Each structure stands twice: as structure tokens, then as C-alpha cells.
Design a protein around this ligand. Structure first.
Ligand code: HEM
Ligand code: HEM
Ligand code: HEM
Ligand SMILES: [O]
Lengths: 679, 323, 681
């Protein structure tokens, strides 16, 4: 149980009498009044203690990544990695460390939809026996900007316009694309966010990245440069944009509910922790500067080396107390890890400590149960708002004869203390500059686009076409085109058509044809289909529901979550047509006999919106899902112009449809149904 | 200009050099570093004052009605209403008073969709020459509960489940319908929320209500019981649910944008402020108790009297500072 | 151990390496620098997490009573008092309840002197098994004002002038006496604050009062009006003003050190809890309205009935986490107690809950270890800043099918819930007035003055004389005279002399009635344990050996003895440079030490000129028992004190010890203070 240490703060109210927050049993369903129909009395202490706590329930949302959700789990080290790091949680084979992970979007506020297009947070806390260690990462290996002093500019430009606070959770407006084109460093992360990484199927189907180069340091101070990677054991999977848009309205909680259900049903998601390791003398060996967070290291130059596996298997008990209150910091570092002179990382260390003072309005937020380390806290800090401990040592200072030297200093040689890498040097003038080594903003965007499949590439261009079409200012649109033309002339040409703008002339300076592995989503089928969702469209008339139940029980044997849909909640029905939408499922199959709700009288009913069964099948087909029909239900496929000939379309008897749908879920998205420019 | 008094706090940055918050011109696109590829210095005061302000930008959202938008306008009285109220802003024909109005949903958080099904808030401030007078109303004339001590119970039950914070901005989950069925007073507002009032076409196409019976008092202390009504001059209009759902994803800002567009286009929306007036000795004469906020007074028993008109004709300049 | 429940939050750093607040061993004595003499690096996470916690150490002081100190203890009931109250902590003989008590002044900020002249706070929390019950009282039984809405006006007027923030911790300025004269209800508390109650010898030598009439209610709902009293088992004792003033400079921590020392030495102070009980139908039957907080109920009309005893026997471990952070509320009420329509108490209920939001900057302050009840919290409250728990019940609302009805409602008959007194009614028009029964502002101030001894009365007149002479505005001073004249023409006449104003009788409220239990100096102390004796000695000759034997015998009687000399020779507790008469309750010159009172021994680089003579002079002039052993008689002579004066003891060691211990019971010798008319020719 990853949540074991949280047991002692849990409050059980079963069988208990209602109390105030200072004890004493009460009733609190009636205000105290002066006469039968009289005014409420100030002396009603019960009312005011209850309402005061309600009145003050909210705390400020995170300044970025406000929308998110998380879970507890366990990290297991695969080996004794003392040859590369002194870090205790990586110090022995099969060593286990509790974790908590919070996934998120970036731009939207607390209540915005999970399926907005956005970068995604992927933040992990290791509660190691030598302190909390956070990898505060994203699902994309590069960031928009090269210096942390520019983060407010990026965020302001992406978040809603400050006059009317429009639009919510979206980069599709003038200020964002004005920034993207005025600060060309942003073009790499933008391309990733315009790819499938911007609309992932779930948190469980994301890879994760620390982005920055850090340092791993051994006991003797020798260091290696390192990139952190999380490799999902579920495989990477993405939606298509037209599907994410509807899903945002039909279920804004799609991702947080997906993670909750996977854990609750015993299908805990897993990620392997992997590293790229680079010697210090190769920091600038690979065509870019590893201090530059707008570049990633191609795995051709440094393969991913697996160090262990993380499994998330415990949901929180109270979302606010745990998920909302947890306070991540890249400065949560432990012995055996160090920073690098990455100018974006450098400013993060300041920003995350400082921002907790706003979100928690006090300096004692690390005493909150979800923030507490398991290893013990011994220092001379005292007081502060909400001080929750009582310190014995009255000589709260160092050095001191009266406390006998305790708490005592720890460094590299004694007490397993943290230490900065011994060899790191400073040299040169104090400057407000960036190294000329950072100046290439176009090569790696071109490399990323090169390494996607043709329809994957078309998804990127259609995202850009959609987004830039919302930009009202003509010059900004031409600025965007001028910058895309430096990445690829064909990309600029294809986007220019949607904007009604001329195809610009080639600017070949940064063009190249190289490819790299591990960045594509749609070029690989899923390693498992467990937890994927099948909507079975049925009907309460005839014998369709009995067949739908048999279909359901077989699909569940493969670990799928199957929803039987009909006009009303008859026996065996999981959802009504009125509440159903194709966005909820990874495959749609029509049960035999249910073709009666796709035309005529069965399609016109007061119990669901007109055309709803046909709309679900149409949606599922057009969004690239496996779609199927059993027996006579093939007529439902005919009614929407779909043929069994097609990839990802299955008809025939039950066992044939089951095998086909299950194969199709491995493919997940059938890109044959998406037109490519000049195909 | 309804916003006339706010111009002295307006700050124009066109044509100026970047400064810190304590003055002095600066550049702030590069951190100070110790060497060409070096670490950032703690003595970069420019960096820290810039990032500290960004780090501290957010304030807690409203505990309810967190999702909303507003605008400025003018209220004009149609008459000298001194025979029923001493209220200064109603004391003369054609008297004008600045207003600000915020419209909202109730359950959803700051970034939830405008076209969620919900009660809608309709909060009006009159900046009168005798103090601020707020009518903090909804687009539905009745409320769920009969005693304010039960508000945390109602709100907890409708807002997302506290274990996983699901579902956003929605009554369609177990705890809400548990409460509606366990606290039967809730059924009136429920029915209103399940009608077109729950999914309006826009803020301009809603009516508004103070809900509670209040009192109008004259100079010499004579009182009448009063119900406040806002009657939209744009007409009431609503969507259908299957459309509001898609709209929640296609444009979460639909109502926000619609209000902004109408004002900027010169199509300012208006409402008439109207009252039902009841003698004190009739507080219990109409088949219910006028102190009970789960009931409305049918207009057959007391028709509306029109006091004046409000027009919303100026959008805010900074959403945060104003709305 | 009354602190037992707090042991789970205590942190032991002995034998440990230094860490950050998120774990990980560290060193934090050098900033991380870019080169040997380089600038400090922003990536020094150790520096910033260290200094951030330092930079955010302070919280707002209390808006009033900012200055004070407290301790843990035990309350023991003397009986089963369910015949008068359903309160659990009073439900069985020898039933014990943990307490915390904080004493305080009122006007001064956090770092002002203990021995300022002021009303004093006396706040007790009972951690009962049916919730926290607080009695938030003062060492004076009456308050300045009759309606809580006037509290900011009173407090603004006695706190420093808002232009220069002058004066600190004092009523002796224009605005305060402008308010006392403009709002005559304040005159009663003013007289108490001008008496010994304003300058008590220690927290342990104060009585305590709930002030308000409350209600005790039995299980069946029958009620009685009640006044709470704390009666100190150490006796009431007070300083004189000219001594309190010097003490404010020589030791601003005099009272909090007193309490800490008494508890550490095993002399835990005690108070008895006593009540006055009044029938509901007699609320207005004793010459005033018992809803009026400017009145007290004379003990001749209703005697004190002891319910139990409280003993304070454990100091805090961390002052900030316990004493500074504790949040008292008169709304901290339990089953068996109820409020009254006293308009001052009424507004207090709102104000103490509200002010916690400012001091603790969040609504979860009852989760702080010092504020937590011992009885258990079960409700549907959630979230809030700094939420320290993780609630299991996901159906956080009532009523509810899904949560099976839990947590469940408790009332009078089910679950031992709180209930308002059943017979209480409201009748009449909603009003912004006060009952005309509150109108008399002068009778009880006169009753209080009438009940003090002649020198005690002179202390009151001399305090007013001192204070009003600071008022620059002439009309304010005359306004003060006119109001004083309504209490007593003689009092007004004697104050007028100091102010140079003219002395006519206004007899509407004059009377000669007296009542018991309001004087301090008319009764000697029941014990001299913990009282302090300064033994003045010297390092030359045999004086020190004699002073040690003197100290030994005095300590056998429970006295705290300080032997003083030129330097810290063996057996010396304090140097003359560091000593002052304010620190002691009696001053004894050891034999041989007369050499430091004149000639060569009195002029030394090791202490200020004349310091031993000044300590003895201060001690005598301030009414203390003073003594000299053997030849040290000459020291008394050098300051003009005669051996046979009251409270002056000369002779051999044995008679001096006996005389000093007897004089400590008297405590202050009031024949040394002139009374108006004494100097007449
Ligand atoms: C490689 C670049 C970055 C990555 C991978 C990243 C990732 C993240 C993630 C995952 C979170 C959400 C943590 C959670 O779930 O609670 C977050 C929040 C935050 N980020 Fe970043 N971020 C980056 C850049 C920056 C920069 C440059 C700044 C400012 C200099 C910044 C300031 C913040 C702040 C203030 C928060 C809110 C933290 C809180 O309120 O607890 N981020 N970031
Ligand atoms: C007739 C019944 C009610 C109506 C018409 C109503 C209306 C509103 C409206 C329109 C707002 C948002 C105003 C804005 O745009 O900022 C609001 C917010 C709020 N309401 Fe109500 N409400 C009702 C019942 C209650 C009750 C019973 C309580 C608690 C006792 C309550 C507590 C609050 C609070 C605390 C806020 C947050 C206000 C702020 O943060 O500024 N409401 N209400
Ligand atoms: C009989 C009248 C009163 C008595 C006996 C009394 C007593 C006390 C005491 C002893 C304290 C300090 C408790 C501690 O040591 O922490 C205190 C604080 C305080 N008092 Fe009163 N007081 C009275 C009148 C009032 C009134 C009328 C108000 C306002 C309506 C008021 C407002 C406050 C506030 C706001 C605090 C600060 C509490 C905190 O910060 O925790 N008091 N009072
Ligand atoms: O971030």
C-alpha cells in the first residue's frame, strides 16, 4: 500500500455524531432564530463555524497546469546503480520507493476539459529514504523557451486574452501565435503539441520526459549528464482533433476518470524509468548544446537505458487533500543528482518554491501529509503560519555549544549530505545573454516532422491549419508562415492553403531529411488492449440484448470494458442512447437486431436525440475506431455508407467480429480514413 | 461612460520602456549568468521581481459561481418611486446610476463550460449616490433550500465527488440526486434547472430574480414586501441539451463571447427592473409563506410594476481587475 | 502530564544530521558561489528553503491582548454538579480535565512590558470530553462598554495615537481619557485598572472573571444565570506604580518569568473555580440588569460557590506553537452552558471566530495541535488552506441516503448535542438601542472606591493624578473632572489638585455602601512560597559565608533567594550591576556588606555609582520588607531608615529571617505612603 503513511491522518465519520471543529456534538440543519418566523441570531455559533469553513474552502489554482489529476504508486529499481549515481532510491536491485504522480494540461484553469489540445504535465515524486525527489516533467521532451525569465511571456500569450478572458484552454488565438512566431524557439514544442502528444488518449498512454539535462553524481563526485524518460507500458495513443473537441463537452473528465477506473479495476498503469547518459565532454557533441531545453537527444546517439519501473496502483482518498495540495519542485533534489546550467531549469528552482507561498499562503506547506518526506526533518526552522510541530531543541541555531553540534552538518564525506558536483566551474563575464550555441530553432522541428508517418504528418498540418485559422491579424498569419517555411517549405505551402495565403519561396538553410526513432505515435500498435472500451449498440426490442450480453462477456475476457447501450436501462443495459457518445469508447459494435434503431421508427424515439445511434456509429467510423456489426446488424453499417471491405470494419458472426475488433484495438486508429494533401 | 470613475487607475504602456515594479527601466528577456554557459545569479533582481509577480498571479475562485463574465452599464429610473421606497437611485424620473453586472453558472470551476446545465447567477451592483446596492440574483426565481445553514450540504452534493473530483459542472451524478431526493425542498429549483432555464442561449436572453422577499421602506417607515424581477428586452431563449453538450466542447466561452460581441457591436442588451409589491399583512395569504425562498408569487396574484431600465454598454478593460 | 496529547507532534533533532524541510541531509552554513569570491547561485536550493522559512516566521499579533504568556495544567471538579449543569467536565467528583491558560495585558503590542498598567487577560481552555470550553476572562469583573459594536472605539482610543504610534501600552494620553469621559460606562473598569488590579505582582496573584452573566443548563433544560470566578490560592498582590515603571525597563518579562519559574521549581499555582448562581426571574432584582457587563454582583447578594480547582503545572515546550498560536473563543461552548442577551458578549461570539482568519490566515486553525479538542471532530467540512486531514466519507452532506445518515444530528435528547436554553424568548421590536436598565454608570464605581482601604484609595487617586496629568487638552481634563465628580466629590477634589483645576457636589449617585472581595491590600497572603529575597552582600570579608547560610534557611521556607555582590564569586547569584530592587519582594543586607553603602566600597568600576544604596532605597520606598543582619544595621542608617519601623528588621540572622518571612505575608507596608492631608501644617 503506497498510501500507508497517510493512514494516521485519515478521518472516519461512519457511525459518528456531528460535531463542530472544536468538538462537541451538534445539529446543524437549522439556523437559530428569534421566534417562529424570526431572524437568525448572531449567537448561533453552530451556523457560523459551519459556513465559515465552507466560505474558505478554495485555494488558488496552480498558476500553470491547473487542470490535472494524480495517483499513488510504487517505484521498483531494477538494479544497484551506484556506478552511475549515489541516489539512494536507485541503490539496490528491487528497492521499492512510494510515488505520487500528477498529470495535467498546462493552459486551462481548474475546470477545463481534459481533451483540450495542450502540452501535458507528468510530475513524479519519489518519497526516498534520503528525501523527496521530484521529476517535474512533461509528455513532450522539449520546451517552448530557452530562458526562464521568458516564462510569463509564454504563459500570458497562451492563456486567455486579458480583456475578456477568451479563449479557455487553447492556443488557437492571436496572442499565442504572435508569440510562437516572434519567439521562434517555441516552434519545436509547438510541433509536438500540434501532433498526437497534444491530444493523448489517456495519461496512461503518454511517455514522460524531464526535458532538461541533469547530472547523476557518484559518491566520489564523478558526474554524467542525463535525460530522464518515462516509457509507458501501455503504449502511446492519441485521439483526432475533431473527436477531442466533442469529448471536451461530452466528458471533460475523460482523462481523470480513465486513470481512476484503470486503478480501481486492478489495471494499474506502469512506466519504465530510463536514462540517456552522456559524458561531460560530449555536452556539445550532437549538433546542439545539451544545456538547451528546446532540443532532445536522438536515441541513435544515446539509447534509453532502463533503470526500473513505476506502477500507479492507489487512487487518492480525498482529491483536494492529496492531489490539489501536492507541491512539486524541481529543486526537490537528493544526494547523487545535481542541476545543470540550463537557463530554463535555473529559474524553475526559484519559481516553484516561491509559488507555494501563494497557493498555500504560508511557509509550512511541506508539513502537509502529501508533501511530507518519509525520511525525517531535522533543522533549526521554526514558527511560520500553521506550524504543526513542537520542536524540543531550544538552541535553534548553528554553530552552538549548547545544542552539542546538533542538528549536525552533512556534506559529501559525512552524513550522506547533498553536494554540488565537484568539477563544475564558472568562467567568463557576468552576462545577460544566451550562448550562440542556442541559435538553431528550426533543425529539430524539421527532424521531428520528418520522423512521423504520412497521416501523422497530416494531423500536424491540420492542427496548424485549424489553429492559425483563428488568428484575426493578417500580419501574424504571414509571420507564422514565414517561420514555418524555415522548417519545411512543404509544411508552409500546405498550411498556406487553409489561410488563403501564397505559398512562400523555399528557404533551404535548415532543411534536411534526417529521421529519428521514438517520437511517432501512430507507427506502432498497442502492446495491450486491456482497459480499452467497447460500446455495444443494442435495443430493448427483440432478442438483441441477450446477444449483446454474450458479446459483452466474451470481450470482457480480454480485459476490455464493455458498455451495452439501448433506449432505456433494461436488464443488462449499462447506458441509455441519450447519455451515450462515441467519444467514450475505443470501438463501437452494433449488436444483432439493433439495426432497427438506425432507420425508420426505431430511430425516432422520445428517449434519445434524433439520429443518436447513427451518429455514434458515424462518429466512431470517422474518428478511425474499429467498428463492427454482428449478423443482420450489417444493415446498420450500410445505412452510413461503410463497407466490410474496409480496414477496421468488421462484420459476420459473433466470434469473427470479436476477433476482428480485438485485432483492431491493437491498431487503435485506422488512418486509412483520413485524406492527405494531394493523395 | 459607465466606467468613467475607473480611468484614473488605468495604466498605458504604449511607447514606454520596460520597468520594474519599483520603477527604473530594464531589460528582462535574459537571466543574469556567471559566464557564457553559466548558472543564474541570485543577484538578478530583475528576474525575481518579474517571476515573483507571475508566481503570485492567481487568487482563489469564488466558492460558487466561479465561472462567469460581466460588464458595465447604466440604470435609468422611470419615475419618482418615493411613495414606496426612500432608495435614492429610485427617487427621480430619468435618474441614472452606474451598474456592473456579472452573469455565471453555479457548480463549475473557473474554466468549465458556459453551456453546462445549471442555475445561472445574475448579480447587479448599483453604484448609487447613497452607497453600493447589490441585487445578487439568479435566472431562476426559486432556490433549492429553505435555510442558509444547509448551503454547504447542497453545494457539496452538486459539486464533484470529493474522492476523484468527478464530474465537472454537472448535476448528473449520484450525490446530487441523492440530495435532491433527500431534501425535497430542492425539487422546485431542480425542475427549473431541468427546463430551458438550465441551458440558456445567452446571458442577454435570461430573466433575473432576487428570489427573496425584501422590504421597500419610505422616509416615515412604511414598508411593503417586494420581489425583484429583471425582464430581458432581448426575449428568453434556450438551447437543447444535445446541442449544449457539443457547444461545451466547441466553444466553452460561448456566453462570455456572446455578451462581449453584443456590447462591442453596439447592440447593448437591456433589462427592465420590475417588482411585485405585497402588503405586510398578506405575507401568508397566497397559499404559501412569502419568507420561503422555494416559492414564487404567481403574477396573477400580483402583477409586475416596472421601475426602470438597465442597459449594459461597456466591456471591462482588464477582466481580472474588474470581473 | 497535561501536555501528554502533544507528544505525537514533538520533534527531536538531537543526534541527527541537518535536513531540508523535504528531507535529505545537508550543510547550510555556506551559500553556493560561482567561484572563490563569486556571487551566490540561484540554484542554491538549500539557501532559499532555509531563508524562506525564516522570512515567513511572523504571524499577526493578537489585535488585543497581544502581550502575554501561558501554561498547561489540570482542572479537578470537586463534585457531581449535574444538579446545576449538564457540562461533562463538571459531572463527577475528582474528574480531571486538561487546561491551557494564557494571561496577558490588553493594549500593548507583543514586546511591551508585563508591568504596564492595564486590564489583564485570564483565558482558560478546558479540553473536555465533549469539546473545548473556553472561559475568556479578565482579572477585573467589569468591562468598559455595554455593546460590542463599540469595541473598536474603546480600543482605538487606548492604543497609540494613529499619527506617531505614541504611547506604547498605556492609557495615559489624550485620546483614552477623551473616551473615558465621553463614554461614562467606562468609568467602572477604569477605577479597577487604576487600582492594584492594573499593576498586579504576578499572574499567579490575580483573580479571574468571566465578567458576563452566562447560563448553566441541566439535562432537562432548566437554567440558572451564572458568573464565573477564579480565586487565586496564592492571594492577590499588587505593586506600586513608581516600582512597576522601573520594572518595565529592568525586566519586561517579569510576569512571564514569574510563572515559568514557579512551574519549573515545582510550585505550580492554583485557582479555585467558583460561581454565583441567580434565578432567571431575578436577573434585574439586585439594583442593576445582570445583562449589563459594566456591573458585578456583590457577594453579599450571592456568595461564591466553589466547583473545583485548576493547577498550572507544565510549561510549554515551544512558545510560538503553543502560547502564541492558541485561539480562544467565547463561542467555544459545550452542552450544559449557554449565552445570555448581554450585548457585549453577543458581538464577541462573532469577533473571535472572525479574527482567527486574520491571525492564522486560513480556516483550519482548529487543527493546530494546541487548538485541537481531545473529543473528536466528525462533520462534513472539507478543504480550506492547510487542510491537515484526509477525510474518508465521500458523501460530505446531509441529509443523505448514501452516507446512511452519518455523521448524524445530535440535539438535547439524542447524541448529547448542544441545545439553546429551551425557555428563552424574544419579545418586542427590532431595535438599535440599549435597555434603559443599563443607564446607571456611576453607582458601582462609587461602591468599588468605597470598598478599598484608605491607602488603596490613595493609590487609585494617585494613578488618575498621574494619568490625567498627561492629557494635553484642557477641556478633556475638565470633562474627566466632571465625570469623576459624579462618582465622588472628594475623589474629584483630590484629582483636581494635581491638575490645577478648581474643585461642586453632584450627589445623584453618591452613597456609602461597601462590598467585600474587591480589595487587595486589606488581606495578607496565604503563603510566601516562591517569593523572592535579594540578599545584598560583598566579596570582601566574611559576608558571603553568612549570606549563604541566610540563603539556606530562607530557601527552606520555599523562598527564591538571590545573593548579590560586586562580582560572581563562589556563592553569588547576581552582580550589583545586574541587580535591581524590582526583582525582589524583600531586600536583606548581609552582615559586613555595609561597606558598599559608603566610602570606598560604594565607588567601584564593577557597578553603577550608588547601586547598593539605591536597591535598598527602592525596596524601602516601594513598601517591601527590608532588613539588615548584625553590623549591616549601618546600611539602613545610611539611607535614613530606623530599625523599629514597620516592615524593617534588624538583629541577628535568626530574628531577621523570622521578621522577613512575617513581613512577606503583609507584602507591602502601606504606612510608607502619604495620604492626602498628611502634609498639612
Ligand atoms: C522544461 C520545462 C518545464 C516543465 C517540464 C514543467 C512542468 C511542470 C509541471 C508538470 C507542473 C505541474 C506540477 C503539478 O502537477 O503539480 C508545473 C507547474 C508549474 N510550473 Fe512548470 N514546467 C516547465 C517550465 C517552467 C518554468 C520555466 C517556470 C518558471 C520559471 C515554471 C513554473 C511553474 C509553476 C510556478 C508551477 C506551479 C507549481 C505549483 O503551483 O505547485 N515552469 N510545471
Ligand atoms: C436566493 C439564493 C441565492 C442566490 C440568488 C445566490 C446568488 C449568487 C450569485 C449570483 C453569486 C455570484 C456573484 C458574482 O457573480 O460574483 C453567488 C456567490 C456566492 N454565494 Fe450565493 N446565492 C444564493 C444562495 C446562497 C447561500 C444560501 C449562501 C451561503 C449562506 C451563498 C453564498 C455565496 C458565496 C459565499 C458566494 C461567493 C461570493 C464571492 O466570492 O464574492 N449563496 N451567489
Ligand atoms: C468582558 C469583556 C471581554 C473580556 C473578558 C475579554 C477578554 C479577552 C482575552 C483574555 C483575550 C486574549 C485571550 C488570549 O490570551 O489569547 C481577548 C482577545 C480578543 N478579544 Fe476580548 N475581551 C472582552 C471583550 C471583547 C469584545 C467586546 C471584543 C469584540 C467585539 C473582543 C475581541 C477580541 C479579539 C478579536 C481578541 C483576539 C483573539 C485572538 O486573536 O485569538 N473582546 N479578549
Ligand atoms: O510549467
Amino acid at each position: 500500500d503506497a498510501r500507508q503513511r497517510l493512514k494516521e491522518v485519515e478521518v472516519d465519520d461512519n457511525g459518528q455524531f456531528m460535531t463542530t471543529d472544536f468538538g462537541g456534538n451538534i445539529e446543524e440543519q437549522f439556523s437559530l432564530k428569534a421566534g417562529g418566523r424570526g431572524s437568525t441570531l448572531l449567537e448561533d455559533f453552530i451556523f457560523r463555524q459551519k459556513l465559515q469553513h465552507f466560505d474558505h474552502e478554495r485555494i488558488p489554482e496552480r498558476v500553470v497546469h491547473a487542470r490535472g489529476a494524480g495517483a499513488h504508486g510504487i517505484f521498483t529499481s531494477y538494479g544497484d546503480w551506484s556506478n552511475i549515481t549515489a541516489a539512494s532510491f536507485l541503490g539496490a536491485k528491487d528497492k521499492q520507493t512510494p510515488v505520487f504522480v500528477r498529470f495535467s494540461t498546462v493552459a486551462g484553469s481548474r475546470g477545463s476539459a481534459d481533451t483540450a489540445r495542450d502540452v501535458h504535465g507528468f510530475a513524479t515524486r519519489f518519497y526516498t529514504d534520503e528525501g523527496n525527489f521530484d521529476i517535474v516533467g512533461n509528455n513532450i521532451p522539449v520546451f517552448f523557451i530557452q530562458d526562464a525569465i521568458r516564462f510569463p511571456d509564454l504563459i500570458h500569450s497562451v492563456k486567455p486574452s486579458p480583456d475578456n478572458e477568451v479563449p479557455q484552454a487553447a492556443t488557437a488565438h492571436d496572442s499565442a501565435w504572435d508569440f510562437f512566431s516572434s519567439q521562434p524557439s517555441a516552434l519545436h514544442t509547438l510541433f509536438w503539441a500540434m501532433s498526437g502528444n497534444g491530444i493523448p488518449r489517456s495519461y496512461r498512454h503518454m511517455d514522460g520526459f524531464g526535458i532538461h539535462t541533469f547530472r547523476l553524481v557518484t559518491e566520489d563526485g564523478k558526474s554524467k549528464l542525463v535525460k530522464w524518460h518515462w516509457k509507458t507500458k501501455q503504449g502511446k495513443a492519441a485521439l483526432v482533433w475533431e473527436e477531442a473537441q466533442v469529448l471536451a463537452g461530452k466528458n471533460a473528465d475523460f482523462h481523470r476518470q480513465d486513470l481512476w477506473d484503470a486503478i480501481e479495476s486492478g489495471n494499474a498503469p506502469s512506466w519504465e524509468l530510463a536514462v540517456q547518459l552522456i559524458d561531460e565532454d560530449k555536452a556539445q557533441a550532437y549538433g546542439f548544446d545539451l544545456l538547451d531545453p528546446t532540443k532532445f537527444l536522438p536515441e541513435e546517439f544515446a539509447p534509453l537505458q532502463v533503470l526500473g519501473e513505476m506502477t500507479l496502483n492507489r487512487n487518492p482518498m480525498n482529491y483536494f487533500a492529496e492531489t490539489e495540495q501536492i507541491s512539486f519542485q524541481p529543486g526537490h533534489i537528493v544526494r547523487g543528482v545535481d542541476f545543470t546550467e540550463d537557463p530554463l531549469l535555473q529559474g524553475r528552482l526559484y519559481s516553484y518554491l516561491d509559488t507555494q507561498l501563494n497557493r498555500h499562503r504560508g511557509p509550512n506547506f511541506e508539513q502537509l501529509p502529501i508533501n511530507r518526506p518519509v525520511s525525517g526533518v531535522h533543522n533549526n526552522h521554526r514558527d511560520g503560519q500553521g506550524q504543526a510541530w513542537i520542536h524540543k531543541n531550544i538552541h535553534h541555531y548553528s554553530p552552538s555549544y549548547l545544542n552539542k553540534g546538533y542538528p549536525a552538518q552533512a556534506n559529501q564525506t559525512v552524513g550522506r549530505g547533498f553536494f554540488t558536483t565537484p568539477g563544475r566551474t564558472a568562467s567568463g563575464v557576468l552576462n545577460r545573454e544566451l550562448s550562440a550555441t542556442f541559435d538553431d530553432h528550426y533543425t529539430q522541428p524539421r527532424l521531428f516532422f520528418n520522423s512521423l508517418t504520412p497521416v501523422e504528418q497530416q494531423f500536424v498540418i491540420n492542427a496548424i491549419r485549424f489553429e492559425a485559422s483563428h488568428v484575426t491579424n493578417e500580419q501574424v498569419k504571414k509571420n507564422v508562415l514565414e517561420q514555418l517555411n524555415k522548417i519545411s517549405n512543404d509544411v508552409a505551402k500546405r498550411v498556406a492553403v487553409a489561410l488563403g495565403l501564397e505559398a512562400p519561396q523555399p528557404d533551404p538553410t535548415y532543411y534536411h531529411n534526417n529521421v529519428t526513432r521514438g517520437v511517432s505515435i501512430f507507427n506502432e500498435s498497442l502492446p495491450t488492449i486491456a482497459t480499452l472500451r467497447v460500446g455495444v449498440l443494442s435495443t430493448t426490442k427483440g432478442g438483441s440484448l441477450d446477444k449483446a450480453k454474450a458479446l459483452k462477456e466474451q470481450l470482457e475476457k480480454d480485459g476490455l470494458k464493455v458498455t451495452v447501450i439501448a433506449e432505456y436501462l433494461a436488464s443488462g443495459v449499462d447506458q441509455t442512447y441519450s447519455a451515450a457518445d462515441a467519444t467514450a469508447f475505443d470501438a463501437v459494435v452494433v449488436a444483432e437486431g439493433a439495426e432497427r434503431v438506425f432507420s425508420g421508427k426505431g430511430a425516432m424515439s422520445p428517449l434519445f436525440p434524433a439520429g443518436r445511434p447513427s451518429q455514434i456509429l458515424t462518429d466512431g467510423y470517422r474518428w478511425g475506431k474499429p467498428v463492427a456489426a454482428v449478423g443482420s446488424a450489417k444493415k446498420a453499417l450500410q445505412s452510413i455508407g461503410v463497407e466490410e471491405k474496409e480496414a477496421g470494419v468488421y462484420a459476420g458472426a459473433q466470434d469473427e467480429v470479436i476477433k476482428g475488433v480485438e485485432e483492431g484495438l491493437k491498431v487503435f486508429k485506422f488512418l486509412e480514413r483520413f485524406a492527405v494533401d494531394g493523395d
